[PDB]
Amino acid sequence: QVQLQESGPGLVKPSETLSLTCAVSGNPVTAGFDWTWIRQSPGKGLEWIGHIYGASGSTNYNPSLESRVTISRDASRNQFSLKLTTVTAADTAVYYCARRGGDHRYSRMLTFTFTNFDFWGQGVLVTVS
Amino acid sequence: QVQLQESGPGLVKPSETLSLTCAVSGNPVTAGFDWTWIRQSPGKGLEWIGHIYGASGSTNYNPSLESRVTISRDASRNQFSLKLTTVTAADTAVYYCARRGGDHRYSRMLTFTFTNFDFWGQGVLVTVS
Amino acid sequence: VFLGFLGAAGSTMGAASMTLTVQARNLLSTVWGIKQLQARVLAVERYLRDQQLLGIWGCSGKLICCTNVPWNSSWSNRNLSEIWDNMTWLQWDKEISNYTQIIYGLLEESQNQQEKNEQDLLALD
Amino acid sequence: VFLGFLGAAGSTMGAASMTLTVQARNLLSTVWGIKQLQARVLAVERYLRDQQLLGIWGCSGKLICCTNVPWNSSWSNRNLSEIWDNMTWLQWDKEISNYTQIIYGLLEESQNQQEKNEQDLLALD
Amino acid sequence: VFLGFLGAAGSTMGAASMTLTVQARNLLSTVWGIKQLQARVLAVERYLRDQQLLGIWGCSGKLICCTNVPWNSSWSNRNLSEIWDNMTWLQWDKEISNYTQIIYGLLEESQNQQEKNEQDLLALD
Amino acid sequence: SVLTQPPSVSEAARKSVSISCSGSDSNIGSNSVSWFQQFPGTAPKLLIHFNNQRASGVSDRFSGSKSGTSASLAISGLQTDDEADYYCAAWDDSLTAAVFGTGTRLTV
Amino acid sequence: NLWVTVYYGVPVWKDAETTLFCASDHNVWATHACVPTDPNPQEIHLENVTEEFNMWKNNMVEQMHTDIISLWDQSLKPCVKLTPLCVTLQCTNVTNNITDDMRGELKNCSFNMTTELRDKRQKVHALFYKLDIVPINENQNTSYRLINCNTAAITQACPKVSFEPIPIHYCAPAGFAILKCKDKKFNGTGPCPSVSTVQCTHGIKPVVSTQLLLNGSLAEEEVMIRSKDIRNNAKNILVQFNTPVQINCTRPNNNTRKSIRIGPGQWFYATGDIIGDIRQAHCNVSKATWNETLGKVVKQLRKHFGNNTIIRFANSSGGDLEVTTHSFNCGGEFFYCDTSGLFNSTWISNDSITLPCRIKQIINMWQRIGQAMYAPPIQGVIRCVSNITGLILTRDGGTTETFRPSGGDMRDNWRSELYKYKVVKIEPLGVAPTRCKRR
Amino acid sequence: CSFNMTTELRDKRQKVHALFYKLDIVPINENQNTSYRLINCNTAAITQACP
Amino acid sequence: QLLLNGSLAEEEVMIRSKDIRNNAKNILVQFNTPVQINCTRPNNNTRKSIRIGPGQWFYATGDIIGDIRQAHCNVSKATWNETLGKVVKQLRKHFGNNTIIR
Ligand SMILES: *[C@@H]1O[C@H](CO)[C@@H](O[C@@H]2O[C@H](CO)[C@@H](O[C@@H]3O[C@H](CO)[C@@H](O)[C@H](O[C@H]4O[C@H](CO)[C@@H](O)[C@H](O)[C@@H]4O)[C@@H]3O)[C@H](O)[C@H]2NC(C)=O)[C@H](O)[C@H]1NC(C)=O
Ligand SMILES: *[C@@H]1O[C@H](CO)[C@@H](O[C@@H]2O[C@H](CO)[C@@H](O)[C@H](O)[C@H]2NC(C)=O)[C@H](O)[C@H]1NC(C)=O
Ligand SMILES: *[C@@H]1O[C@H](CO)[C@@H](O)[C@H](O)[C@H]1NC(C)=O
Ligand SMILES: *[C@@H]1O[C@H](CO)[C@@H](O)[C@H](O)[C@H]1NC(C)=O
Ligand SMILES: *[C@@H]1O[C@H](CO)[C@@H](O)[C@H](O)[C@H]1NC(C)=O
Ligand SMILES: *[C@@H]1O[C@H](CO)[C@@H](O)[C@H](O)[C@H]1NC(C)=O
Ligand SMILES: *[C@@H]1O[C@H](CO)[C@@H](O)[C@H](O)[C@H]1NC(C)=O
Ligand SMILES: *[C@@H]1O[C@H](CO)[C@@H](O)[C@H](O)[C@H]1NC(C)=O
Ligand SMILES: *[C@@H]1O[C@H](CO)[C@@H](O)[C@H](O)[C@H]1NC(C)=O
Ligand SMILES: *[C@@H]1O[C@H](CO)[C@@H](O)[C@H](O)[C@H]1NC(C)=O
Ligand SMILES: *[C@@H]1O[C@H](CO)[C@@H](O)[C@H](O)[C@H]1NC(C)=O
Ligand SMILES: *[C@@H]1O[C@H](CO)[C@@H](O)[C@H](O)[C@H]1NC(C)=O
Ligand SMILES: *[C@@H]1O[C@H](CO)[C@@H](O)[C@H](O)[C@H]1NC(C)=O
Ligand SMILES: *[C@@H]1O[C@H](CO)[C@@H](O)[C@H](O)[C@H]1NC(C)=O
Ligand SMILES: *[C@@H]1O[C@H](CO)[C@@H](O)[C@H](O)[C@H]1NC(C)=O
Ligand SMILES: *[C@@H]1O[C@H](CO)[C@@H](O)[C@H](O)[C@H]1NC(C)=O
Ligand SMILES: *[C@@H]1O[C@H](CO)[C@@H](O)[C@H](O)[C@H]1NC(C)=O
Ligand SMILES: *[C@@H]1O[C@H](CO)[C@@H](O)[C@H](O)[C@H]1NC(C)=O
Ligand SMILES: *[C@@H]1O[C@H](CO)[C@@H](O)[C@H](O)[C@H]1NC(C)=O
Ligand SMILES: *[C@@H]1O[C@H](CO)[C@@H](O)[C@H](O)[C@H]1NC(C)=O
Ligand SMILES: *[C@@H]1O[C@H](CO)[C@@H](O)[C@H](O)[C@H]1NC(C)=O
Ligand SMILES: *[C@@H]1O[C@H](CO)[C@@H](O)[C@H](O)[C@H]1NC(C)=O
Ligand SMILES: *[C@@H]1O[C@H](CO)[C@@H](O)[C@H](O)[C@H]1NC(C)=O
Ligand SMILES: *[C@@H]1O[C@H](CO)[C@@H](O)[C@H](O)[C@H]1NC(C)=O
Ligand SMILES: *[C@@H]1O[C@H](CO)[C@@H](O)[C@H](O)[C@H]1NC(C)=O
Ligand SMILES: *[C@@H]1O[C@H](CO)[C@@H](O)[C@H](O)[C@H]1NC(C)=O
Ligand SMILES: *[C@@H]1O[C@H](CO)[C@@H](O)[C@H](O)[C@H]1NC(C)=O
Ligand SMILES: *[C@@H]1O[C@H](CO)[C@@H](O)[C@H](O)[C@H]1NC(C)=O
After folding, report:
1. Do D66 and E117 touch (CB under 8 A)?
2. Are G301 and G125 a contacting pair, CB within 8 Å?
3. Beta strands per DSSP E along C8-120
4. Cβ neighbour number for residue A5 with a 10 Å cutoff
5. Where does the record place the region Fusion peptide (chains C, D, E) (predicted)?
6. Nearest residue of G to residue B31 by CA position?
7. Best mutation site among C76, C96, C98 for ligand 6 pocket (most ligand atoms within 8 Å of CB)
8. Distance between CA C8 and CA C23 in Å, rounded?
9. Burial class of residue G433 in the structure, from the number of CB atoms within 10 Å of its CB (0-12 exposed, 13-18 middle, 19+ buried)
10. CA-to-CA distance for E84 and E92, rounded, in angstroms?
11. DSSP letter at C106?
C-alpha cells in the first residue's frame, strides 16, 4: 500500500540541527494526510513530535518541542522532513516517520483528532554525542 | 358597527391574476386594524391568506401563498384588496375579507398575534376554470 | 467666511460677478466619524475637479478668465444688457444648461491645447 | 523630504526665504483607521485653504508673490534691514499677528478683484 | 471621462502629447467605508503632490511647461526623432527612470527659485 | 401547520359538549386561541377570542379555555340551532401566520 | 463679437441630497458627538430669490429619522441586557389601595432571578403593568410572561442616560447650503418668494410623539394645514398651531425603585412598590383653549374642504394601544394617553379636559423586530408641562368630513420643523458671453 | 437525535428531535448508548446561517 | 477540484501553473467548452422551527417525506471523456508527446 522510509544522519553533535527525511512510495505527500514524526527514547515509550498536513502545508508541533521543530514537505521528491534544532542529550531516540491517515468518510473536524498511525517506517536511531 | 363587502370577478382563468376588493363601511381602512383575506376551499376548512395593517401599510402573508399574494388598501375609497397571481385549480374557494381587530387596551406586541376576526363579509365564490 | 454667501444670487450677473470670492471661500471646508469624513472628502474632490477644469482651460488661479472660444448664437442670442444687467446667474444657468458640455469641450478640446502647442512652438524660436 | 525642514527657522527672514520649497514639500502628506484618516483629510484641507488664498490674491503657483497693496506703517515701521537681515520669521509673525486679517482683506477685497476687472476691461479693447 | 484613457500609451511620444487631458481627467476621482475612503484620500494626495511639484517648477496650471534647465546628454543622447517620432512614453520612462530625481532637483533646486528671485528683483526697478 | 380538532361531535340537546383543539408550541402554546361558528352558506361568526373572551352577540352557552398546547370550547345547554362547523384558530409564530383548525361538525 | 468667459464662484445651485452634520449647544441622543454650534449663527437674506420648496420630498427628514434611530441604538448598546427576565412570573393582585380606574393595571409578580453567582438564585418580586405582562394560559394560576419573550430580546435603558430631547442643529458640509423659507404663509410646497441661506437649521428637539405634536414650532400668523395631497385620504394632514395649547401630564403615584443584581455589575431596576395610594396617570388641557384651537383648525380646514362643510373630529378608530393613543416620554416614563376626549366634536358652519393615560415599561420604538427596551422606573411623582404645537390628522374617507388622530410615522414630527429648509449643492463654475478675448 | 433544548423562558426546557447527518454527529463513547455530540462542540462555536 | 460556473477558454483548453515542473504547485485547467453537471438532493426534506430564545429560531431537518435516497451528481460520459482527451493533449504539450497521462 504505502511504504515510508526514513533516511538521515545517525549521529548529530550537541547544539547542531538534526535533519531526517522520510521518503513516501505509493502515496503523494500532497495528499490530505498528516505526515508525522514520532520518536522513542531508548527504554522509553513513544513521543509524538509533530505533523504537516500534506494538502495545505499547515503544521502542528508538540508544545514541548515546537520552538525547536520544523516539519516540511517536498512534492517534487515526494518526501517530508523533520528539522530538530539545538539537539541535546535528551534528544537521543529512534525517530520514526508515520502517516496519521484519517478517514475519508469523516469531516476534517473529526479526523484532525485521530491518532490512527496506519503506516510506519522502521526508524533511525539518532545518538547525540 | 362595521360592514365589510367583497366584490370582484366570480370566475378567473388559469395563470391569470385574481383581484378581489373589500369595501369597508363604518370604519376607516387607515385604522390600525389588520385587514385580512381568508379563503375556504369547497368541502375544506378555513385558510388564512394574509393581512395589511391599515395604520402603516405593513403586510403579512401566508408563507405558502406569499410569493403570489399582494394585499393593499386605498384610503380614498375606503377599500382594501387581494391580488392573487398565477391562479390554479387549487385556488378555487370562497374568499372572505375580515377585520382582525385587536384590543385597543393591549400593546401591539400582543394584539399582533390575535385571531379575533370580529367582522366578516359574506364571501365571493371564485372558480378557476 | 459665511458673510455675504449667495447674497448676490438674486442680483444681476454683472452685480453678482463682483462677489466671486465670497462663494469661492465657502466651497472648501464610529459610523458618525465616517459619513461626515466622506462628506469632507467629497467636498475636496468636488473642489479639485472644478479646479482641474479651470486649469485644463488656461484659467488656473483665476476667478474671471477669458478665452479665444467665440460665443455661438445657437447657445444664446440675448444681448449683453439682457445677460449682465437684466438677468441673474440662476436664470442664465437654466438657459445655458443644455450647452455646458459643448462649451467646456471647446474650452478643453479645441482651445488651450492649441494655445499650449502654439506657445511651445513660439518658445523654440 | 524631511531634509532641511525648518532649518532656517532661526535664520533671518532674508536667509529663510531661499528655503520655501523645503517647508512647502512637508505640508502635504477600526477607529485607528479613522482618526489618522481624518488627520490626512485635515492636512489636505489646510493645504488647499492656503492654496485657495494664494489664488484669490494673484499669487497662484508662486511661493514669492508681489502685489499692488502698499505697506502701511501702522502695521510695522521697521526698516528693510531690521526685517530681512536682523529678524526671523517667527519674530515677524508675532509682531504682525494683529494685522494679518487686514492685509489679507486688502489682498482679496481690494487688489486682485480690481486687477481682474481691469484685465477683463483691457482685453476687450 | 474614461474615453481614450491610455489610448496613446502605445503611440509615439509626439502623438501621445496631444492626449494629456484625457489621462489628466482620469487621475482625480463599516470597514468597507474606510478602506475605499482611504483610497479616495490617497488619490487626492497623489494628485496634489504632483500638482505641488508642477507648481514648485513654474509649471502650475500647465500640462506642457518649458524651463531654462538644459538637457544633459548624460541623461539621454537620443535625437528628437528617436524620442518624439520613434519612441513611446513607457519606453522613455524606463530609459530615464535613473535620472528623474536629478532633473526634478534641477527644476526645483536651481531654476524657478532663481527665476522667482530674479522676478522679485526686476519688479523693484 | 394546522390545528387538530375532532372531525365531528354529537351530543343530546340540553347537554354539554366540549370541542377540543390541539396545536404545538409555536401557536396554542405561545399565543391565544379564538373560536368561530360557521353555518353552511355563510361566513364564520366569531364566538370566543383571547382564549375565554366572549364576543358581543354570543350567548352564555359558549365558553372556552387554553392549557399548554391544547384548547377547548365548552357548549352547555345545547339547542337544536347550534348545529354548525366550529373552528379554532391561533397565530403561529414560526410561520407568522394565523392557522385555523380542521373544523368540528357539531350536531344536536 | 462675444467670447466665452468663465466665472468661478457663481451664486448658482441645484437641488441635492447630501449628508448633513449635527451641532449642539448622559443623554440618549449623543449631543457630545455633534460639533459645537456657532454662538452667533449667520443668516443671509437672498433678496429677489424665489425658490421652490417641497417638504414632502426632503432628504433632511429621512436623514434625521436615520440619525435618531442610530443614536438611540448607540445609547442602548452598552446598557444592561435583561435576558434573565424571560422566566415564568407568578403575578398576584397588588395589595395597595387602587382606584377603580386602575383596578388590574398593576400586578405583583414574583420570579426566580439570577445572581452574581451562577450557582445561586434569588427570589425577587416587582410590580409590573398589565401592558407588559401576558398570560401563559387561560387558567388563572398566576403564571405570566413578559410581552417580549416570544419575539424579542429586551435591553434595559441606562438609568443615567436622559431621554430629554435636546435641540439638534443640522449643518451643511462645505460646497452645500441650506435655504430657509421665510414666507409666513408657506404651506410646505411650491414657490417661496422670501428665502435666506443659513449655516445650520434652528435647534430641532428630537421629540417623538403620536397624534399631538409637542414642544415644536408655532405658526407665525395663522394655523397652517399641510398635506402631500389634501384630497388623498391615505396621506396625513399636519396642523401647525399659531398658539400653544398647554398640556399638564402627570404620574401621580409615588413610585419606588428596587435594584436587583442579576450578574457581575448588572443591575435590574424594578418598580418594587408604590408609596401611598395608586391613582391613574393623566393629562389635562384647558377646555376653552382647546376649543378655540379647534375652531381655528376647522376654519382652516374649511378653506380646503368647503365653507359649508361640517367638520367632525372623531377619536382614533382602534386596534391597539400605540395606534390609538398619544404617546410620549414624560420624565423618563412612557405615557399612552387616550385623546378621545379631545377629538369628539361636530363643527357645523353657520374647566379642563382630563385624558386618561396608561404607562408601559417595555418599549418598542420604530416597530423593530428582535429588540425591545425596558424603561427603568422613575422614582417619585412625574409632572410634565408641554406645549401642543400641532396635530397629525387623517381624514375618515370613504356634506360632512370626519378627521381622526393618526400616529403617522416619526417623519411627521420632525417634518413639521424641517418643512422650511432645503439642501442645495453649489455650482460655482459658470460660462457667459463677454467682449473679453484672451491675448 | 433527541435532545433537551432551551425555550423562550429560561426556567423551561423542551424535548426536541431532529434528523442529523452522520458527518455532523460524533459519538461521545464507544458504547452504543445513543449518546452523541455535534462535531463542533469541542473546538468551535456554531452560528446558524440566516434562512 | 472542479471549477463551476466560470469562464471558458476562447480557443483551446488552457493548462496554467506557477511552475509546471514543481509538483507542489496546482495546475489550473480551463476548458474551452462547458461540461454540464446535474446535481440533486432527491429527498423531499421538511423544516422544523424550534424556538430557542426570544426570537431565536433553530431550523432542524425534522423529517423526510417519502423514501431516503442518496444525493448525487451526473455528468455526460461522452462529454467528460472528450474533455479529458483535450486535457491530456494539452498536458502532453508540457510533459511529452509519448507520455501516458493517468
Ligand atoms: C416639553 O418641554 C418641557 C420643558 O422643557 C418638558 O418638561 C420638562 O422636562 C424635564 C425632563 O423631564 C424636567 O426636568 C426634570 O425635572 C424634575 C423635577 O423634579 C427633576 O427631578 C429632574 O431631575 C431628575 O432627572 C435628571 C435627568 O437628567 C437627573 O439628572 C436628576 O439628577 C434627577 O434624577 C429634571 O430636572 C423639567 O422640570 C420639565 N419642565 C416642566 C416645566 O415641566 C417636557 O417634558 C417636554 N415634553 C416632551 C414631550 O419632551
Ligand atoms: C408583593 O408580594 C410580596 C411577596 O411575594 C410581598 O412581600 C411580602 O409582604 C408581606 C407583608 O406583610 C411580608 O410579611 C412578607 O415577608 C413579604 N415577603 C417578601 C418576600 O418580600 C409584597 O409586599 C407585595 N407587594 C404588594 C404591593 O402587594
Ligand atoms: C432686487 O431688485 C431690485 C429692483 O427690483 C434691486 O434694486 C435690488 O438691488 C435687487 N436686489 C439685489 C440683492 O440686487
Ligand atoms: C453653432 O451651433 C450650431 C449647432 O446648433 C452649429 O451648426 C454651428 O456650426 C455652431 N457655430 C460655430 C461657429 O461653430
Ligand atoms: C437687445 O437690444 C435690442 C435693441 O435695443 C432690443 O430691441 C432687444 O429687446 C434686446 N434683447 C433681445 C431680445 O435681443
Ligand atoms: C434643453 O433640452 C431639453 C430636451 O432635452 C428641452 O426640453 C429644454 O427645453 C431645453 N432647454 C433649453 C433652454 O433649450
Ligand atoms: C545663528 O546666528 C549666528 C550669529 O549669531 C549666525 O552666524 C548663524 O548663521 C545663525 N544660524 C542660522 C541657521 O542662520
Ligand atoms: C494705516 O492704518 C491706519 C489705522 O491704524 C489707517 O487709519 C490708515 O488709513 C492706514 N493707511 C492707509 C494708507 O490706508
Ligand atoms: C533703521 O535705520 C536707521 C538708520 O540707520 C536706524 O537708525 C534705525 O535704528 C533702523 N531701525 C529702525 C528702528 O527704524
Ligand atoms: C496685539 O493686540 C493685543 C490686544 O488684542 C495686544 O495686547 C498686543 O500687544 C498686540 N500686539 C502687537 C504686536 O501689537
Ligand atoms: C501602432 O503602430 C502602427 C505602425 O506599426 C501605427 O500606424 C499605429 O498608429 C500605432 N498605433 C497607435 C495607437 O498609434
Ligand atoms: C551631466 O551629467 C554629468 C554626470 O553624469 C555631469 O558630470 C555633467 O556636469 C552634467 N552636465 C552639466 C551641464 O552639468
Ligand atoms: C540620430 O540621427 C542620426 C542622423 O540621421 C542617425 O544616424 C542616428 O541613428 C539617430 N539616432 C541616434 C542613435 O542618435
Ligand atoms: C539604472 O541603474 C541601474 C543600477 O542601479 C542599472 O542596472 C540600470 O541599467 C540603469 N538603467 C539605465 C537606463 O541606465
Ligand atoms: C384580582 O382582581 C380582579 C379584579 O377584576 C378580580 O377579578 C380577581 O378575582 C382578583 N384575584 C385575586 C383574588 O387575587
Ligand atoms: C422558583 O423556583 C422554585 C423551584 O426551584 C419553584 O418552586 C418556585 O415556585 C419558583 N418561584 C417562582 C416565583 O417562579
Ligand atoms: C400648497 O400650496 C401649493 C402651491 O404652492 C398648492 O398647489 C397646494 O394645493 C397647497 N396644499 C395645501 C394642502 O395647502
Ligand atoms: C387635572 O385636573 C383635575 C381636575 O379634577 C385635578 O384633580 C388634577 O390634579 C389635575 N392634574 C394636573 C396634571 O394638573
Ligand atoms: C399646568 O400647571 C401650571 C402650574 O405649574 C398651571 O399654571 C397651568 O394652568 C396648568 N395647565 C393646565 C392646562 O392644567
Ligand atoms: C366650542 O365653541 C363653539 C363655538 O365657537 C361652541 O358651539 C361649542 O359648544 C364649544 N365647545 C366646547 C366644548 O366648549
Ligand atoms: C372612541 O370612543 C368610543 C366611545 O365613544 C370607544 O368605544 C372607542 O374605543 C374609542 N376609540 C378608541 C380610542 O379606541
Ligand atoms: C363625546 O361627546 C358627547 C357629547 O357630545 C359626550 O356625551 C361623550 O361622553 C363624549 N366622549 C368623551 C370620550 O368625552
Ligand atoms: C414619597 O413618599 C416618601 C415617604 O418616605 C416621601 O419621603 C417622599 O417625599 C414622597 N415623594 C413624592 C414625590 O411624593
Ligand atoms: C410654550 O410656548 C410659549 C409661547 O409664549 C413659550 O413662552 C413657552 O416657553 C413654551 N413652553 C414650552 C413647554 O415649550
Ligand atoms: C432530558 O433531560 C432529562 C432530565 O432532565 C433526561 O432524563 C432525558 O434523558 C434528557 N433527554 C435527552 C434527549 O437528552
Ligand atoms: C442521474 O442518472 C441516473 C441514471 O440511473 C438517474 O436515475 C438519475 O435520476 C439522474 N439524476 C440526475 C441528477 O439527473
Ligand atoms: C441536466 O438536466 C437537463 C434537464 O433540466 C437535461 O436536458 C440535461 O441533459 C441534463 N444533463 C446531464 C449531464 O444529466
Ligand atoms: C475515451 O476516449 C478514448 C479514445 O479517445 C477511448 O480509448 C476511451 O476508452 C474512452 N473512454 C470512455 C470512458 O469512453
Report:
1. no
2. no
3. 64-70
4. 14
5. 1-15
6. G317
7. C98
8. 10
9. buried
10. 10
11. H
Cell readout for G289 is 383653549
For B1-129, list the strands marked E by DSSP: 3-7, 11-12, 18-25, 34-40, 46-53, 59-61, 69-74, 79-84, 93-99, 119-120, 124-128
Looking from the CA of G205 toward its CB, the CA atoms found within 13 Å total 16
Of G162, G151, G214, G167, give the one whose Cα is nearest residue G384: G214
Rg of chain H over Cα atoms, rounded to whole angstroms, equals: 13
- The cell for G140 is 388563572
Q: Which atom of ligand 5 is nearest to the CA of C82?
A: 11
- Asked if C49's CB is within 8 angstroms of E44's CB, the reply is no
Q: How many residue pairs bridge chain C and chain G with CB atoms within 8 Å of each other?
A: 172
Ligand nearest to the CA of C92: 6
- Take residue I28 and report the three cell numbers written for it: 489550473
DSSP G27-75: BSS-TTTSEEPPSS--EEEETT--EEEETTS-HHHHHHHHHHHHHHHHH
Residues 1-30 of H with CB under 8 A from G: 8-12
Tell me if chain I has a CB within 8 Å of the CB of G370: yes
Q: Does residue I62 line the site of ligand 28, with CB under 6 A? A: no
Grid cell listed for G173:
458640509
This structure's resolution (Å) is 2.8
Q: Does G362 touch chain I if contact means CB atoms closer than 8 Å?
A: no
Using a 6 Å cutoff on CB, does residue G289 contact ligand 18? no
The secondary structure of I11-25 as a DSSP string is SS-EEEES-TT-TTS
The contacts of residue G75 (CB under 8 Å, 6+ apart) are: G27, G28, G29, G30, G157, G158, G161
Residue I82's H or E segment, with its range, is helix I77-95
Contact criterion met (CB < 8 Å) for B111 and G320? yes
Q: CA-nearest residue of chain F to G145?
A: F30
**Is there a contact between D60 and C60 if contact means CB atoms under 8 Å apart?**
yes
Look up residue G204 and give its DSSP letter. Answer: B
Which residue in chain D has the smallest CA separation from E117? D64
Q: How far is F17 from chain G (nearest CA, A)?
A: 19
Are the CB atoms for G238 and G201 separated by under 8 Å? no
Q: Does the CB atom of residue D95 touch ligand 10 within 6 A?
A: yes
What are the cell numbers at H40? 463542533
d(CA F63, CA F72): 9
Report the structure determination method.
Answer: cryo-EM
The C-alpha cell at C27 is: 466651497
Task: Delimit the domains of chain D by residue range.
Answer: 6-122
Query: Edge to edge, what strands does the sheet with G362-363 contain?
Result: G153-156, G371-374, G362-363
Q: Answer yes or no: are the C-beta atoms of G23 and G173 closer than 8 Å.
A: no
> Which residues in chain C have Cβ-Cβ distances shorter than 8 Å to G63?
none
Q: Radius of gyration over alpha carbons of chain G, in Å?
A: 26
Chain I residue numbers touching G364 (CB-CB < 8 A): none
> G29: which 3 cell numbers?
441622543
Please choose, from the candidates G380, G170, G438, the residue with its C-alpha nearest in 3D space to the C-alpha of residue G254.
Answer: G380
Report the distance separating Cα G75 and Cα D78, nearest Å: 60
Count of positions (residues) in chain G: 439
Among the bound ligands, name the one nearest to the CA of residue G44.
Answer: 3
CA of G423 to the centre of ligand 3 (A): 24
Phi, psi of G20 (to 5 degrees): -95, 150
H40 interaction partners in chain A (CB closer than 8 Å): 109
- Distance, in Å, from the CA atom of A121 to the CA atom of A22, rounded to the nearest integer, reads 8
Q: Taking the C-alpha atoms of G67, G68, G70 and G75 in order, what is their torsion angle to the nearest 10 degrees?
A: 140
Burial letters A11-45, b for 16+ CB under 10 A, else e:
ebeeeeebebbbbbeebebbeebbbbbbbeeeeee
Mutate to test the interface with C, among D44, D50, D57, D62 (most CBs of C within 10 A): D44
